[PDB]
Every structure is written in C-alpha cells, then in structure tokens.
Amino acid sequence: DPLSETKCTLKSFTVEKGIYQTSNFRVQPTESIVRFPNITNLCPFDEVFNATRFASVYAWNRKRISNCVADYSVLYNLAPFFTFKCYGVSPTKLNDLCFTNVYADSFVIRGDEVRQIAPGQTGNIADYNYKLPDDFTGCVIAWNSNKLDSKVSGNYNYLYRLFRKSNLKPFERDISTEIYQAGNKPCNGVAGFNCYFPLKSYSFRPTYGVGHQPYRVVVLSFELLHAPATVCGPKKSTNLVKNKCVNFNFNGLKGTGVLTESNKKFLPFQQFGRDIADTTDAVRDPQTLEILDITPCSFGGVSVITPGTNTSNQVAVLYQGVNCTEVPVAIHADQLT
Amino acid sequence: NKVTLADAGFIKQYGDCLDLICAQKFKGLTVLPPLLTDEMIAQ
Amino acid sequence: TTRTQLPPAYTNSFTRGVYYPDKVFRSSVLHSTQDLFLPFFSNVTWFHVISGTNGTKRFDNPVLPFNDGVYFASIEKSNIIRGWIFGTTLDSKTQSLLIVNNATNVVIKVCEFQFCNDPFLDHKNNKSMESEFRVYSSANNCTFEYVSQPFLMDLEGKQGNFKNLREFVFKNIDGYFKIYSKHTPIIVREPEDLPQGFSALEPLVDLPIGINITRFQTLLALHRSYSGWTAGAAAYYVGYLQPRTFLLKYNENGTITDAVDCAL
Amino acid sequence: KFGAISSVLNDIFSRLDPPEAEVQIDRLITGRLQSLQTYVTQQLIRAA
Ligand SMILES: *[C@@H]1O[C@H](CO)[C@@H](O)[C@H](O)[C@H]1NC(C)=O
Ligand SMILES: *[C@@H]1O[C@H](CO)[C@@H](O)[C@H](O)[C@H]1NC(C)=O
Numbered sequence: 001d002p003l004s005e006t007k008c009t010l011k012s013f014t015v016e017k018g019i020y021q022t023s024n025f026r027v028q029p030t031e032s033i034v035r036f037p038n039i040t041n042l043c044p045f046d047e048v049f050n051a052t053r054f055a056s057v058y059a060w061n062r063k064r065i066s067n068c069v070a071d072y073s074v075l076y077n078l079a080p081f082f083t084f085k086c087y088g089v090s091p092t093k094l095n096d097l098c099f100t101n102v103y104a105d106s107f108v109i110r111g112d113e114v115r116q117i118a119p120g121q122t123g124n125i126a127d128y129n130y131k132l133p134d135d136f137t138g139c140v141i142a143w144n145s146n147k148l149d150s151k152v153s154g155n156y157n158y159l160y161r162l163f164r165k166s167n168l169k170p171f172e173r174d175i176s177t178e179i180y181q182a183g184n185k186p187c188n189g190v191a192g193f194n195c196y197f198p199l200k201s202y203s204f205r206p207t208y209g210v211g212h213q214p215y216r217v218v219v220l221s222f223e224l225l226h227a228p229a230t231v232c233g234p235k236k237s238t239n240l241v242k243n244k245c246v247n248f249n250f251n252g253l254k255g256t257g258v259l260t261e262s263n264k265k266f267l268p269f270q271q272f273g274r275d276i277a278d279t280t281d282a283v284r285d286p287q288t289l290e291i292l293d294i295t296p297c298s299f300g301g302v303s304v305i306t307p308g309t310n311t312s313n314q315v316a317v318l319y320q321g322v323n324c325t326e327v328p329v330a331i332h333a334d335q336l337t
Numbered sequence: 338n339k340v341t342l343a344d345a346g347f348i349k350q351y352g353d354c355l356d357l358i359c360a361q362k363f364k365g366l367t368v369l370p371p372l373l374t375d376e377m378i379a380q
Numbered sequence: 381t382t383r384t385q386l387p388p389a390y391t392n393s394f395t396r397g398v399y400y401p402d403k404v405f406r407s408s409v410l411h412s413t414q415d416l417f418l419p420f421f422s423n424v425t426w427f428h429v430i431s432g433t434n435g436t437k438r439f440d441n442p443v444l445p446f447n448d449g450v451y452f453a454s455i456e457k458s459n460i461i462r463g464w465i466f467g468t469t470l471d472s473k474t475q476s477l478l479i480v481n482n483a484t485n486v487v488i489k490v491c492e493f494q495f496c497n498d499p500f501l502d503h504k505n506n507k508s509m510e511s512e513f514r515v516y517s518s519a520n521n522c523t524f525e526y527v528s529q530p531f532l533m534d535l536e537g538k539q540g541n542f543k544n545l546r547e548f549v550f551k552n553i554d555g556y557f558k559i560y561s562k563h564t565p566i567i568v569r570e571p572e573d574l575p576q577g578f579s580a581l582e583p584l585v586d587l588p589i590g591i592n593i594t595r596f597q598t599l600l601a602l603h604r605s606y607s608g609w610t611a612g613a614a615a616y617y618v619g620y621l622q623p624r625t626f627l628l629k630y631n632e633n634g635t636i637t638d639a640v641d642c643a644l
Numbered sequence: 645k646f647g648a649i650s651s652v653l654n655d656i657f658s659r660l661d662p663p664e665a666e667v668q669i670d671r672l673i674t675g676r677l678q679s680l681q682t683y684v685t686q687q688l689i690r691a692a
Binding site: 096 | 658659661
Binding site: 276279295299301321 | 367
C-alpha cells in the first residue's frame with residue numbers, strides 16, 4: 001500500500017506528515033502485432049553458391065540477392081562447411097532480421113593461409129587483391145571441401161593469387177596481369193631480370209595430401225534499413241491494432257505505443273516519420289498503404305500524502321499531470337502496481 | 338503580454354498532447370506547476 | 381561532318397542543386413545535413429544545341445568525365461535531348477548505360493555495346509520499325525533490364541510559348557544510382573541564365589547497379605532537316621558536385637522551401 | 645553514439661550477442677549518466 005511504499009522508500013518504520021514521491025506509473029502493452037511485407041518466392045541460396053567451380057581468386061564474382069524470403073537454418077543444418085563467424089551479427093537471429101540488398105560473392109583460396117587472409121585481418125591474399133572494412137555487417141563462411149570438390153587431376157583448375165604489387169582499391173578484383181617489374185626497370189622475357197607471373201601458381205597435386213583444402217568463401221552485405229527492405233525474414237504477420245498501447249513490429253521496427261491515424265503529408269518515396277527529438281512518430285505500412293502515427297501510452301509520477309504515522313494510517317495519492325478520466329483506479333488490467 | 342512569449346505552457350493536463358513540451362515529456366522530462374498562482378500573487 | 385570546335389562558356393548557378401537527401405519525412409524543422417550538393421553561385425557550362433552553321437551537325441556531345449555527380453538541366457522548348465550514356469571508355473569492351481525515350485518506355489539496358497563516333501536519334505519515327513537504334517549496333521552480354529513509364533512526363537501538346545525546365549542530378553555511390561528530376565514552366569524566353577528560385581529535386585527511382593563510370597555522354601534526336609541531320613534549337617547545362625554541409629528548412633507541408641550551406 | 649555501435653536499444657540488442665551487448669549497453673549508460681549529472685549540477689549552480 002502507499003504507506004508501505006513510503007516506508008520502504010524512506011528506510012524507516014515511522015513517517016511524518018508531508019507529501020513524498022515514491023515511484024511512477026505506466027501502462028503495459030496488452031498484445032503484440034507484426035506487420036511484414038509479403039513475399040512468395042523462396043530466396044535462392046544453394047543454386048547461387050553450391051554449384052560448379054567458383055569464380056577466380058583474382059576476379060571474384062558478385063551475386064545479388066533481393067526480393068525473396070531467406071531462411072538460414074537450411075545452411076545451418078547443411079552438412080560440413082562450418083565456421084560462420086559473424087563479426088557483428090548474432091548467428092541465431094538472422095531469420096528474425098529482415099535484410100536489405102544482400103550481395104553474394106564467390107571466393108577460391110588455397111586454404112593454408114585462410115586464417116591470416118580472413119576478413120578483418122591482414123593476410124597474403126588480403127594484402128594482394130581483396131580488402132574489407134574494419135567491421136562489415138556481413139558474415140564470412142568457409143566451405144572446407146574435403147574430398148569430392150578437391151581437384152585430383154587438373155593441376156590448374158582455378159589459379160592462385162601468387163603475387164600483387166600492393167593492395168587494390170576497396171572492393172575491387174585483381175584483373176591485373178602481365179609480367180613482374182624488377183627494381184632496375186621491368187624485366188623482359190623472364191631471362192632479363194627474373195620476371196615472375198603474378199598468378200597461375202595454384203599447383204595442388206593429389207599427392208599434396210597435406211596441403212590445405214578448397215575453402216570457398218561467401219560474404220554478404222546488408223543492414224541499411226534507410227530504404228524499404230527487400231530480403232525479409234520468414235516471420236508471420238498479423239492484423240494491426242489501432243488506438244491501443246500495443247507492441248508493433250513494423251518491418252522490424254519493434255516498439256510499444258498507441259497507433260492512431262496520421263495526417264502527415266508523406267511523399268510517395270518517404271517511408272519513416274520522425275520528430276524534433278529523433279523519434280519515429282509515424283510509420284508506413286509494409287502492407288496495404290496506410291500512414292500511421294506512433295505515440296507511447298500514458299505514464300506519470302505518483303505522490304503520496306500522509307498526515308503522520310502517529311496521527312493516522314490514512315493516506316492520499318496524487319497522480320502527476322494526468323487527467324482523472326483517462327487514468328482511474330478501475331483500469332488495473334495492465335497498469336503498473 | 339510582454340513575457341508570455343516563453344512560458345511553461347499554461348496546460349499540464351495531457352489532454353491536448355495528441356509539439357515542443359510533449360517531445361520533452363515523452364522523454365520523461367516533466368514540469369511541476371508552482372504552488373502559488375498568479376491570482377494569489379496579484380492579490 | 382567537318383565541323384569546327386566551339387568555345388564552352390559558363391553562367392551563374394544561383395540557388396540550385398537541392399534534393400531530398402533522406403527518406404524520413406519531417407515538417408517545420410530546421411535540419412542540417414552533410415552531403416554532396418551544388419555550391420551556390422558556381423560555374424555551370426551551358427552548351428547551346430543550336431543548328432550548327434545553319435544546318436551542319438556539330439559535335440555537341442562532349443566526353444565529359446562523371447567525377448562524382450552531374451546537374452544536367454534543360455530549357456528546351458520541345459523534346460530534343462534524350463540519352464545519358466555513361467562509360468569508362470565508350471566501347472564494346474566496357475559495360476555502359478543509356479536512358480532512351482523510345483515510345484513510352486525508358487529501357488534501362490545494362491549491357492556492352494559498340495558505339496558509333498556520332499550517336500544520334502530521330503525525333504520523328506521512321507515511316508513504315510524505325511532505324512533510330514543506330515547509336516549502337518552490337519550487344520554482347522547483359523546483366524540488368526528495367527522497363528517502365530518514361531522519365532519525362534512533360535507534354536508540349538497543350539500549346540507553345542512555354543519551354544521546359546527539366547532538371548536532373550545523377551548520383552552514383554557504393555553501387556547505387558539515384559535520379560532526381562523536377563520540371564517547371566518558364567516565363568521569360570531568355571535562355572542565358574536560369575531563373576533565380578529554389579527547387580527541390582525529388583527522387584524518382586533508385587538503380588542498384590554498381591558499374592564503374594568515369595565519363596558521361598549525351599545524345600540528340602535529329603530526324604531530318606525539314607543536308608545532314610538537324611532539328612530545332614536546344615540548350616542544356618552541366619555542373620559537378622562535391623561534398624558540403626547544408627541546412628534545410630522543412631515547411632508545414634514538410635517540403636524544403638529553402639536551404640543554407642555552411643561554408644559560402 | 646558514445647562509442648557504441650547503435651543508439652537504438654532494440655537494434656543493439658537484436659544485432660549483437662549477449663557477451664558484447666552488456667558492455668555495449670554499459671557504455672551508453674555511462675554516457676547518459678554523465679549527461680544527467682552534468683545537467684543536475686548546472687541546475688544547482690543556477691538555483692544558486
Ligand atoms: C567561372 O566563370 C567566370 C565567368 O564565366 C570566369 O571568368 C571564370 O574563369 C570561371 N572559372 C572557372 C574555374 O571555370
Ligand atoms: C500546406 O500547408 C498549408 C498551411 O498549413 C495548407 O493550407 C495546405 O493545404 C498544405 N498543403 C499544400 C499542398 O499546400
């Protein structure tokens with residue numbers, strides 16, 4: 001009761017006359033609603049990565065993923081090719097998240113230096129051709145080919161990034177070719193000043209039973225959220241609830257508030273609303289178009305008035321800055337305390 | 338009239354709150370009304 | 381033809397080069413943004429597409445490097461300029477883009493084409509499937525296609541006496557292409573300078589292709605002299621973009637009525 | 645940002661694992677606490 005709350009907050013068994021601040025009241029959400037875009041087609045992953053010989057190490061191919069529903073439990077359960085070390089992603093929350101413009105790439109490497117050429121760390125191939133940002137949103141997956149995908153007859157297959165003068169521009173291939181340049185002018189015809197071809201030195205034999213394994217790598221790019229999302233996770237969507245402090249999950253924008261009609265003159269491209277204080281007060285439906293307002297439900301402070309413990313135990317409660325009708329005591333269904 | 342350019346707001350009943358006081362209020366920044374009113378002060 | 385060179389000139393840009401930088405709607409707020417924009421009162425080249433030498437084709441399609449952005453504009457009375465070909469070296473070995481206005485579609489063709497020395501089109505369709513597609517003859521490999529309603533909604537069928545004020549900004553970054561267009565009627569017939577007035581360049585469509593472009597080329601439509609290929613008069617403006625810091629003032633309608641930079 | 649990854653609690657929670665999200669939230673907590681103590685100190689020095 002208010003007397004017990006005041007005694008607890010005052011750390012005493014006796015309370016003198018006066019008014020005291022104890023805690024605050026708020027309205028808890030009664031339900032949750034999810035509004036998500038509807039996508040019929042399933043997102044192609046096995047047919048875009050699990051395939052024949054991948055792109056060259058120097059010239060890696062980029063595959064694009066958009067307008068699809070992507071599930072990652074299939075790759076989680078699919079066989080060896082383990083690792084999947086997400087730098088800034090929870091590995092179990094990919095399905096929940098709805099992504100934007102996922103870009104797929106094909107890599108081929110030796111495998112003996114995968115640890116050093118791993119993204120986020122400097123390595124031989126990393127300093128040769130491919131550079132990655134300090135923290136890319138995507139995840140790196142190494143496909144450890146054990147027996148079948150390892151070539152045992154072809155001595156070349158896919159070449160190796162043998163040499164490169166310096167690291168290339170960010171997110172660029174290594175189409176660079178021709179002969180090595182010696183210190184005293186570039187050499188001519190190998191025999192001049194020991195020209196070395198900067199590639200073709202993959203050279204793994206079947207007798208090379210101890211030298212690495214094919215470690216094909218895929219890297220994705222996502223997490224923009226400024227534009228409307230394209231690749232959305234496989235989650236159900238339910239009907240929206242208006243004029244209620246409800247848990248909304250509009251296209252991943254999870255939050256609690258009272259949803260009401262909005263008169264905002266949203267331009268056709270504009271998707272999200274905001275206010276002065278960097279708060280999304282409006283939202284656009286990822287379903288049938290409807291501009292919707294966002295407003296958190298009521299809350300305020302609670303003050304306790306007592307005439308003194310010795311005088312009486314009768315107390316009075318003042319609710320701060322709230323109209324009486326909107327917040328009576330007979331609404332104790334989701335109110336605090 | 339001269340000083341009423343900036344004020345507390347003259348309303349704290351939240352009924353009109355659905356745009357400056359409300360933005361701060363939604364971040365839990367309240368204003369408590371003074372004990373004495375202008376009528377008493379003028380008296 | 382054996383046309384001669386022309387000296388490019390410049391004119392004042394006044395208050396131009398404003399587009400919506402963010403998708404979030406806001407009204408009655410003074411937000412400051414840091415992005416690439418046209419500095420106020422900057423030099424802009426204003427190539428005049430006039431019938432060269434009273435009926436001789438001119439090479440008014442310079443190979444202009446793209447750098448970081450463009451401000452292609454038009455004070456054309458009619459529709460004479462179509463084509464915004466981009467390319468690293470403008471050959472069949474480099475992936476190139478083009479924005480045509482054939483019929484009522486844009487045809488955003490992302491492929492490699494062999495390009496003629498002087499690519500041009502015909503404003504009037506040929507009599508009896510027209511031979512206008514002489515800008516390229518061969519196409520090897522194709523990646524992306526986009527067909528939709530034409531990027532020019534302006535019609536001259538109403539009447540004359542009013543020219544167009546088509547405005548365009550082509551922005552490419554980190555494998556994306558954003559277009560911002562806006563048209564207004566013009567009152568004064570003088571084409572020397574753009575009217576002094578604020579304009580907002582609303583985004584139209586985002587293209588996601590990540591082709592590397594180091595040059596810009598435009599095309600013209602010259603159906604027939606009615607010797608050589610020529611048409612009426614035209615004029616377009618070319619201006620580059622650089623990063624800046626700007627302040628925007630959204631109105632009660634939520635639109636940007638004016639903008640103020642922070643370095644002028 | 646206060647040196648964090650994101651200023652949104654839901655974003656920093658769903659986009660991060662527990663063992664790093666704890667210090668992620670801690671940094672923002674410390675920054676906002678510094679802001680609050682500075683503000684209340686200014687309030688006192690003005691009430692002076
Ligand atoms: C800018 O234009 C003015 C007038 O047209 C000219 O005098 C000046 O040389 C130009 N400067 C540049 C850098 O184009
Ligand atoms: C813009 O705001 C004005 C004044 O608030 C209003 O009269 C008008 O209807 C709004 N919309 C447009 C398109 O002008």
